[PDB]
PDB file of C-alpha atoms and ligand atoms in Angstrom:
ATOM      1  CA  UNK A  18       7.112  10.242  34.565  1.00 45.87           C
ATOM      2  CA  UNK A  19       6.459  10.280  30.937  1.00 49.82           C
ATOM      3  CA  UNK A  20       2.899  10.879  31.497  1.00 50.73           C
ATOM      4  CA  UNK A  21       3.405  14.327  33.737  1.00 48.88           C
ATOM      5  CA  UNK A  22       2.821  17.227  30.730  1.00 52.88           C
ATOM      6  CA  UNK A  23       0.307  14.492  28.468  1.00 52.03           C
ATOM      7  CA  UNK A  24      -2.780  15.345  27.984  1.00 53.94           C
ATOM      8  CA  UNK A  25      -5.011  13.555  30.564  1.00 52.50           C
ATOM      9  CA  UNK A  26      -6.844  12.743  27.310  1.00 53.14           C
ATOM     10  CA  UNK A  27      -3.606  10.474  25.967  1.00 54.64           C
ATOM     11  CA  UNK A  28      -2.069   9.570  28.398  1.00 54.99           C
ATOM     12  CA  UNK A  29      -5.868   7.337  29.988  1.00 60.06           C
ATOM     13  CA  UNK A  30      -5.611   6.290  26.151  1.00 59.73           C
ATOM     14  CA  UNK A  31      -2.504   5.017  25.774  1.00 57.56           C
ATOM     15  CA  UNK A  32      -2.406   3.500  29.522  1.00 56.93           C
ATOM     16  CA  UNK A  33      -6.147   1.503  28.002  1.00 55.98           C
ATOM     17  CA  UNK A  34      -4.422   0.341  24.469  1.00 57.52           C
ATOM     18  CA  UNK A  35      -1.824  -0.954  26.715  1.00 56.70           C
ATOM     19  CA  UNK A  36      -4.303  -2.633  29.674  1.00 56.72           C
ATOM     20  CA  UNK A  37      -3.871  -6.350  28.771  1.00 56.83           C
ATOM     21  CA  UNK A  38      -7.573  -7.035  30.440  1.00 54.95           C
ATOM     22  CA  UNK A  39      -9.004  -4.962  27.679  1.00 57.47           C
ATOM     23  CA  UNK A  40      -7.850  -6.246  24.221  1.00 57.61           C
ATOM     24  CA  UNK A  41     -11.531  -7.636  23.474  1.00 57.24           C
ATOM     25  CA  UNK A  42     -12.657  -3.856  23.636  1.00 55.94           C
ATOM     26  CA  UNK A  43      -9.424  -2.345  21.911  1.00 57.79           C
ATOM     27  CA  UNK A  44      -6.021  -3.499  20.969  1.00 56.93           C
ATOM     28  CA  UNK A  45      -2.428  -2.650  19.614  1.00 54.22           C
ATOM     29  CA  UNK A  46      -2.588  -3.837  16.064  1.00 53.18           C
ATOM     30  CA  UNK A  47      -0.037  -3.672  12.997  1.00 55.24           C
ATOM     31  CA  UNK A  48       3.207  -4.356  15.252  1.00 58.10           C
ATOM     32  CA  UNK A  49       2.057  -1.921  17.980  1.00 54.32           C
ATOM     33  CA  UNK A  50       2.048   1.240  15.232  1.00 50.74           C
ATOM     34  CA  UNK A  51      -1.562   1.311  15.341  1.00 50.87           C
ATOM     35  CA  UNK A  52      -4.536   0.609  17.644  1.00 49.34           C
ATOM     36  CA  UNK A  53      -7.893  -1.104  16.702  1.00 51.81           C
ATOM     37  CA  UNK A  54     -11.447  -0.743  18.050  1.00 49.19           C
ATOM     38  CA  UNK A  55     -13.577  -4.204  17.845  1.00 49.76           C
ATOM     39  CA  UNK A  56     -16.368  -3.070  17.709  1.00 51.28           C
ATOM     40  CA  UNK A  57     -17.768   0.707  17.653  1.00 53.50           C
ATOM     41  CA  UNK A  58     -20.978   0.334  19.587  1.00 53.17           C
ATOM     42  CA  UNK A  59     -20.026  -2.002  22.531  1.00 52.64           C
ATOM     43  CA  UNK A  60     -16.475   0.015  23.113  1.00 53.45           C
ATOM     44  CA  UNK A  61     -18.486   3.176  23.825  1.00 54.18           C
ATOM     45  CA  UNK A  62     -21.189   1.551  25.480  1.00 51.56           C
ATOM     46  CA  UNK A  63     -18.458  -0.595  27.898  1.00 50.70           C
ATOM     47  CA  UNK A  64     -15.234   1.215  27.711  1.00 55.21           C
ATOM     48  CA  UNK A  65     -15.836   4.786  27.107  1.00 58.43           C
ATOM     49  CA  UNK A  66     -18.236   5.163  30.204  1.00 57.31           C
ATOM     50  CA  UNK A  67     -15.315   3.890  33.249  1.00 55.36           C
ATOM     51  CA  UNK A  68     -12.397   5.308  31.072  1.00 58.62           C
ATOM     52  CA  UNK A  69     -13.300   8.642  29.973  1.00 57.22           C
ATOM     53  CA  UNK A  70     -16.953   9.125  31.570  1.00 56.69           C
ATOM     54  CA  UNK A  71     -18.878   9.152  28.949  1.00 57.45           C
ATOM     55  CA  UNK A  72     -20.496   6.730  25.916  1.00 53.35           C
ATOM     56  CA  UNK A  73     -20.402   8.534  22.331  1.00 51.52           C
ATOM     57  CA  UNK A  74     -17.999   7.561  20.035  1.00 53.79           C
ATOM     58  CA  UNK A  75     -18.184  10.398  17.903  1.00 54.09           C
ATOM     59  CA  UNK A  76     -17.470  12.652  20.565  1.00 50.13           C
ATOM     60  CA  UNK A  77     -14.105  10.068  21.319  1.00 50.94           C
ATOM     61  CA  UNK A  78     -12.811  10.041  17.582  1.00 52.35           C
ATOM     62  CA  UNK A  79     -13.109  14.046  17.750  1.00 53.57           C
ATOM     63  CA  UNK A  80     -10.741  14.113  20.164  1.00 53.16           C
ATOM     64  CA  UNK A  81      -8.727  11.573  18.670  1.00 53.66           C
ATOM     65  CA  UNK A  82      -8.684  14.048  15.281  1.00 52.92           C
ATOM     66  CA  UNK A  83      -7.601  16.964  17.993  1.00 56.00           C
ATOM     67  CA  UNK A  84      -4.592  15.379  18.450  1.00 60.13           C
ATOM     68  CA  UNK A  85      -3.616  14.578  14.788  1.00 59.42           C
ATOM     69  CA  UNK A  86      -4.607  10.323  14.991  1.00 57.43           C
ATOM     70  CA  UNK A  87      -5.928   9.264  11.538  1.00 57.31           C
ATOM     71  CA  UNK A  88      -7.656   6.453  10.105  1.00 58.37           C
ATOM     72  CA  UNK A  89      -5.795   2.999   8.621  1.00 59.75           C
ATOM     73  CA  UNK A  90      -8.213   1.444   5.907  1.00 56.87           C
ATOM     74  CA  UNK A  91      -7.845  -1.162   3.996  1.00 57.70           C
ATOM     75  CA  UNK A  92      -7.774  -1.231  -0.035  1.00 59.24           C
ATOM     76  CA  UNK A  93     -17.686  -2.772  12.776  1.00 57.36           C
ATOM     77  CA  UNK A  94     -13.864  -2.054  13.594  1.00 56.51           C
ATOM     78  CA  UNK A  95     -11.796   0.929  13.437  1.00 55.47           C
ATOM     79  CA  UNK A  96      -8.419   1.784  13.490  1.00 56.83           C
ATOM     80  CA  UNK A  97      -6.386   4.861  13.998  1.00 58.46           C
ATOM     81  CA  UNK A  98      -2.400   5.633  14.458  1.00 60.78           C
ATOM     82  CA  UNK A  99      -0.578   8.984  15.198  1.00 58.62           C
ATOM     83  CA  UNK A 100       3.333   8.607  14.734  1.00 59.42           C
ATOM     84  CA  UNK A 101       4.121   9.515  18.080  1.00 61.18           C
ATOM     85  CA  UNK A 102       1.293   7.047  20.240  1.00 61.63           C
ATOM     86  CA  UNK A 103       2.943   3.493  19.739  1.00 58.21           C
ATOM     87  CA  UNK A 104       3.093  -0.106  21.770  1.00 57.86           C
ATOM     88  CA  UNK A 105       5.769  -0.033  24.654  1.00 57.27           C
ATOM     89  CA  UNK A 106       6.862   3.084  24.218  1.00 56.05           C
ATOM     90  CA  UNK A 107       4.979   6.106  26.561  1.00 55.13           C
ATOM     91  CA  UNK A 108       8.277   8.253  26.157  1.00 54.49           C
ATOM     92  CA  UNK A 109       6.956   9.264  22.970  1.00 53.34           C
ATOM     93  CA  UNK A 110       3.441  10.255  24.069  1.00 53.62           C
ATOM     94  CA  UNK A 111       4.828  14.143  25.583  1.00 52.38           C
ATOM     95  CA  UNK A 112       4.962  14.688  21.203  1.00 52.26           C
ATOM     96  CA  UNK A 113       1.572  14.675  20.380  1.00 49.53           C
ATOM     97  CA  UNK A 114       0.206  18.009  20.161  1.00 49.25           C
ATOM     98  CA  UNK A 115      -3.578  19.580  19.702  1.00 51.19           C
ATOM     99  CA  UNK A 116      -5.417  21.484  16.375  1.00 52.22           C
TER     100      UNK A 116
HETATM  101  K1    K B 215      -6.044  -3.108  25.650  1.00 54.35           K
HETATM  102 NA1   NA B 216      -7.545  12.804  11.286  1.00 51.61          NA
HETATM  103 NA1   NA B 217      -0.727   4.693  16.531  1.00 55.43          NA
HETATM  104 NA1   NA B 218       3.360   6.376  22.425  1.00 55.18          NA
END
């Protein structure tokens, strides 16, 4: 019921971060506060295409910067947080709002 008023956009997200069968593609990372991508090119070329119907990146991360997500870095993979999309806990997901 938490998912009702997400985004379709978020709420497919969050339900793939949490899919178990796909951690080799993408996975909850820093103590579930953040998620990380493996690897760039064979994410959008094997999870973008069943998950959100489509296979460019860019065109995912946009999306991900609609909603506010930003980049972790340290002082190929990527990962991104928002505050409000963490491991376990959907409840918070109706908080994240668009640019
Ligand atoms: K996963
Ligand atoms: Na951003
Ligand atoms: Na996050
Ligand atoms: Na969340």
């Amino acid at each position: 019921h938490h998912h009702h008023h997400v985004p379709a956009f978020l709420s497919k997200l969050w339900t793939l971060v949490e899919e178990t069968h796909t951690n080799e593609f993408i996975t909850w990372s820093q103590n579930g506060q953040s998620f990380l991508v493996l690897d760039e090119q064979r994410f959008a070329k094997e999870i973008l295409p069943k998950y959100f119907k489509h296979n460019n990146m860019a065109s995912f991360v946009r999306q991900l910067n609609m909603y506010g997500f930003r980049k972790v870095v340290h002082i190929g993979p990527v990962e991104f947080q928002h505050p409000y999309f963490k491991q376990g806990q959907d409840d918070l997901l109706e908080n994240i709002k668009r640019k």
